[PDB]
Amino acid sequence: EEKEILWNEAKAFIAACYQELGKAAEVKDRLADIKSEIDLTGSYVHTKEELEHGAKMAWRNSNRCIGRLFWNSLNVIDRRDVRTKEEVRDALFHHIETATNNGKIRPTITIFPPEEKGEKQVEIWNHQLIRYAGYESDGERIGDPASCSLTAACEELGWRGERTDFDLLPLIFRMKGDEQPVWYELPRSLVIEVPITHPDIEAFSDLELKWYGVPIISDMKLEVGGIHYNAAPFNGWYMGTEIGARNLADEKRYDKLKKVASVIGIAADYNTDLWKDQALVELNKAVLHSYKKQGVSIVDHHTAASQFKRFEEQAEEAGRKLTGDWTWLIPPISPAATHIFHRSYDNSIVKPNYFYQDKPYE
Amino acid sequence: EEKEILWNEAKAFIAACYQELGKAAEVKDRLADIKSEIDLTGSYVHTKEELEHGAKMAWRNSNRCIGRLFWNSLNVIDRRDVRTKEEVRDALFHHIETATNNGKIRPTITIFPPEEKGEKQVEIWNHQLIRYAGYESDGERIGDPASCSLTAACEELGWRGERTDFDLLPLIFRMKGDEQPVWYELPRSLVIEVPITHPDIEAFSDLELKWYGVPIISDMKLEVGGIHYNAAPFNGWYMGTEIGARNLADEKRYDKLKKVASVIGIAADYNTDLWKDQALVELNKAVLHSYKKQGVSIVDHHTAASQFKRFEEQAEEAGRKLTGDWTWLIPPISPAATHIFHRSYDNSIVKPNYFYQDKPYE
Ligand code: HEM
Ligand code: HEM
Ligand SMILES: Nc1cccc(CCc2cccc(OCc3ccc4ccc(N)nc4c3)c2)n1
Ligand SMILES: Nc1cccc(CCc2cccc(OCc3ccc4ccc(N)nc4c3)c2)n1
Ligand SMILES: [Cl-]
Ligand SMILES: [Cl-]
């Protein structure tokens, strides 16, 4: 019964995709080719053009993403030909290098072979390709708490972290048929990191903060016309609040606001002093300043929201419905200073899209 | 058919209300009294105790309110005995005075006669009892744009504003049978206002900003057991972001961020400088400082969110379901610094509650 669902999704996807591509006349023959292929094989194989456009549609449909103005310029790398661990590893390394682009971040996705009959071909364990390890024992907190479970999984497989606050996790992924994942240390020459300084407050460097250049989300499933690409890591560039208001600020993450308050010279005693708010602003100013100073792409939430307004206008001009998730679109810093905060959005799910999938570990 | 709906609402309300009040045994006889009363009269009349508790329940059920920890200490003033304009006006004046309480704001509601058969007895036109007028002609912007339509309505009735940025609108309300509302200037001796200064930046007073002490929301309908109290003005104290992040900051309100940036000495040129965020923080620090300096109650969003966490815990301990509206509960300043931002809430509507109703004017 698997193939009846697939056929329906493929009809809807091919019709819409060829329509947008001006190939509506070719729709008829391509679907017949598909229906034969499914009857014979149980599945079908996207053309390069369909795979590229489908990945772009999926970004355009991601309700939670403010960055969607640039959906059509996604650089799609087709790695459905991969068969071995070395090829997976090298394609992951290449993604890091080409997406980094010496700091001028190129929004990129690398697509690996899709699930066959819901059996995975490649299974990536990382949440992002570049991310810091986290440790918790004997009351000692080190690194990124969000990474505790994966870090413990990795250290069961014979990896061992230096237990700095910024250990790079290795790539870790499992191949079909294999029964433990392999892991590979990231070559440091491929990983750009940005030290956090402040434009005005020289003491800010006493915090010794840093973050990595490129967030490469490697654990979501791309669904295009009924085909499930569970391994399809992608990246944009950061919006600064993601680092300054969440990764470095959350009490469950690096929890740095009290130390930020101290180095910027304000007291952290009274809610009514709004010291957390003031610290959040200076930390977020430092993040943008540091990325720009180093020549690594980044966008602030005001410019990002302005770009998203253009996306909304572009949708309307193209007669496409806009969908969005207000609770994820508003930024966590001065949200009411953006137009997003002041309108509502239809949170309907349209496909192609990116979806969550269960982690292979605990 | 009006009375069948009423009977159902009354059963649900009286059962729940007497239950909470430990009067469950009295439920039976009180409902029979109600069913006779509705058969005869078309409606029923709440006891003082039911009206007071029902107003308190309605606040407890207001999904959008972060201030609900204090729902049970609401001071309920029963003015169902009012019949004339002078009595309405004096009860509105008394509400201002007793709720203000020389600055130690007392959360208060004044309840006027309810709708009879959906015909209103008293119809308040003000959105808040104390609010500033707004004007727009010939490209000239004065006052509070949110008040433009009511201000124009008032000036049709023979009132005339001085056209400062902070003219107090008069009370305006209509009595049943009458065909134009009356209006009365507020006695300035009853209206506390707070000039906005900054704790550290003496130049902040050059902005000549002020706001009024007590927000007294006078245009929502209180519904208790099927009875519709359309005229039931109530007040809490302000949460500082309401003034500093919305009333004085919104581009459609007083739009003061560029002037705030100037007096605090930062440039307002580059999104990446986060000058809007920085200005928002200093303006909101000034609002809290000024209310506290003058001795007028106010709460900051951090303390408010801490209190709301206690409300959530109190609900759970009492076996009551919690409902809430996340998009209204998070504050517009540093929302992710509060626990609210990090959980979800059931937005179901339970009654008693406060509801929107159409304005009598345009
Ligand atoms: C080019 C620069 C980009 C920026 C600045 C950007 C910004 C963001 C931000 C800030 C979020 C999280 C919002 C929040 O935490 O509330 C987000 C979510 C998302 N973005 Fe983007 N994004 C960009 C590129 C991309 C790309 C290239 C894709 C895929 C091709 C993508 C797909 C998504 C998805 C799927 C989510 C939601 C993930 C989830 O539900 O967990 N974005 N984006
Ligand atoms: C005692 C101090 C109080 C504080 C600090 C407080 C705080 C707030 C705030 C900040 C909002 C708007 C949230 C936003 O803009 O997103 C709000 C909404 C609300 N509050 Fe409270 N509140 C308090 C007292 C009261 C009282 C006494 C009542 C009624 C008895 C009430 C009923 C409501 C209602 C009904 C709304 C939503 C109004 C609407 O939908 O337009 N609150 N509250
Ligand atoms: N309590 C709360 C309220 C609203 C929203 C949220 C989400 C916070 C969060 C947590 C973990 C991840 C995350 O984002 C994932 C993501 C995916 C794709 C991206 C592409 C580009 C980019 N720059 N960022 C991306 C981030 C958000 N939590
Ligand atoms: N785009 C957006 C997103 C989320 C929430 C909002 C609401 C902004 C708003 C507009 C007008 C009024 C308002 O609040 C009304 C209100 C009612 C009762 C109160 C009791 C006490 C108190 N201190 N404040 C109250 C405020 C909120 N807009
Ligand atoms: Cl991240
Ligand atoms: Cl207000």
Side-chain angles (χ1 to χ4, degrees), chain A residues 271 277-278 285 302-303 334, chain B residues 271 277-278 285 302-303 334:
Chain A
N271 291 347
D277 311 276
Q278 185 165 346
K285 285 166 62 188
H302 305 288
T303 302
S334 313
Chain B
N271 291 347
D277 311 276
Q278 185 165 346
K285 285 166 62 188
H302 305 288
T303 302
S334 313

Side-chain angles (χ1 to χ4, degrees), chain A residues 2-223:
Chain A
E2 298 83 344
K3 66 188 90 174
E4 182 73 24
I5 295 298
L6 193 85
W7 171 240
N8 276 6
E9 297 288 341
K11 278 186 300 170
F13 167 67
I14 289 296
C17 176
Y18 283 43
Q19 189 78 48
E20 294 182 19
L21 283 176
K23 283 174 163 223
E26 321 183 22
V27 169
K28 277 60 65 180
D29 282 8
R30 179 65 172 115
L31 279 298
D33 303 352
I34 292 163
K35 182 165 181 72
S36 65
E37 188 167 357
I38 299 191
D39 293 343
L40 275 297
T41 75
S43 182
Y44 75 105
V45 176
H46 286 126
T47 77
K48 296 319 191 44
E49 189 179 38
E50 290 162 1
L51 178 72
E52 167 176 0
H53 199 68
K56 293 176 172 183
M57 290 163 77
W59 181 11
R60 192 179 71 205
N61 290 327
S62 296
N63 290 4
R64 291 169 163 181
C65 176
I66 195 167
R68 290 181 273 162
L69 181 60
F70 309 107
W71 63 274
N72 199 22
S73 52
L74 180 66
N75 176 20
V76 180
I77 303 177
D78 176 9
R79 284 329 289 290
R80 289 173 295 167
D81 58 330
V82 179
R83 297 298 180 264
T84 71
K85 313 174 160 57
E86 295 74 21
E87 293 169 312
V88 171
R89 176 204 61 203
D90 294 346
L92 294 174
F93 284 174
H94 173 75
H95 186 126
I96 290 165
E97 178 174 271
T98 186
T100 299
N101 193 48
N102 288 122
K104 195 179 173 58
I105 294 175
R106 191 181 301 118
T108 303
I109 181 170
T110 296
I111 296 180
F112 288 109
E115 294 177 354
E116 293 288 332
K117 293 304 162 64
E119 181 177 2
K120 301 185 166 64
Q121 314 295 107
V122 187
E123 174 187 88
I124 295 170
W125 287 33
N126 306 84
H127 161 65
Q128 292 178 33
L129 296 189
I130 304 167
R131 222 185 182 200
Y132 300 129
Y135 314 84
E136 165 81 50
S137 69
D138 195 12
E140 194 186 354
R141 305 280 275 159
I142 296 173
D144 192 357
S147 285
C148 278
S149 46
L150 177 58
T151 301
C154 287
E155 290 196 323
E156 301 295 326
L157 311 156
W159 181 82
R160 173 74 179 192
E162 281 173 53
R163 283 163 163 73
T164 80
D165 270 340
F166 305 106
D167 298 342
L168 296 171
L169 282 164
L171 298 180
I172 169 170
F173 62 87
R174 190 184 59 81
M175 306 293 325
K176 175 187 67 179
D178 291 338
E179 179 63 25
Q180 298 302 346
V182 287
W183 59 263
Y184 304 96
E185 287 273 359
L186 285 169
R188 302 299 183 261
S189 67
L190 302 203
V191 177
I192 287 186
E193 301 181 294
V194 180
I196 305 309
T197 60
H198 190 282
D200 307 327
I201 310 182
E202 298 165 352
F204 210 93
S205 57
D206 293 342
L207 295 185
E208 301 196 297
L209 300 179
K210 65 179 179 180
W211 207 253
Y212 50 87
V214 189
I216 315 174
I217 295 290
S218 61
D219 70 359
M220 311 176 67
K221 161 182 301 178
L222 163 66
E223 183 179 334

Side-chain angles (χ1 to χ4, degrees), chain B residues 83-134:
Chain B
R83 297 298 180 264
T84 71
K85 313 174 160 57
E86 295 74 21
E87 293 169 312
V88 171
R89 176 204 61 203
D90 294 346
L92 294 174
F93 284 174
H94 173 75
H95 186 126
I96 290 165
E97 178 174 271
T98 186
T100 299
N101 193 48
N102 288 122
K104 195 179 173 58
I105 294 175
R106 191 181 301 118
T108 303
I109 181 170
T110 296
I111 296 180
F112 288 109
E115 294 177 354
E116 293 288 332
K117 293 304 162 64
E119 181 177 2
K120 301 185 166 64
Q121 314 295 107
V122 187
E123 174 187 88
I124 295 170
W125 287 33
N126 306 84
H127 161 65
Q128 292 178 33
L129 296 189
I130 304 167
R131 222 185 182 200
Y132 300 129

Side-chain angles (χ1 to χ4, degrees), chain A residues 326 341-342, chain B residues 215 217 234 236-239 242 246 327-328:
Chain A
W326 189 95
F341 182 93
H342 300 280
Chain B
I217 295 290
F234 59 86
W237 52 78
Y238 266 114
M239 172 167 75
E242 293 178 271
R246 300 306 310 281
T327 72
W328 282 57

Side-chain angles (χ1 to χ4, degrees), chain B residues 305-323:
Chain B
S306 295
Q307 291 165 341
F308 187 70
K309 194 181 194 193
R310 287 180 54 209
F311 177 71
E312 317 181 15
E313 294 159 1
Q314 172 206 115
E316 184 64 336
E317 288 160 15
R320 278 185 309 253
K321 292 183 180 177
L322 172 73
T323 57

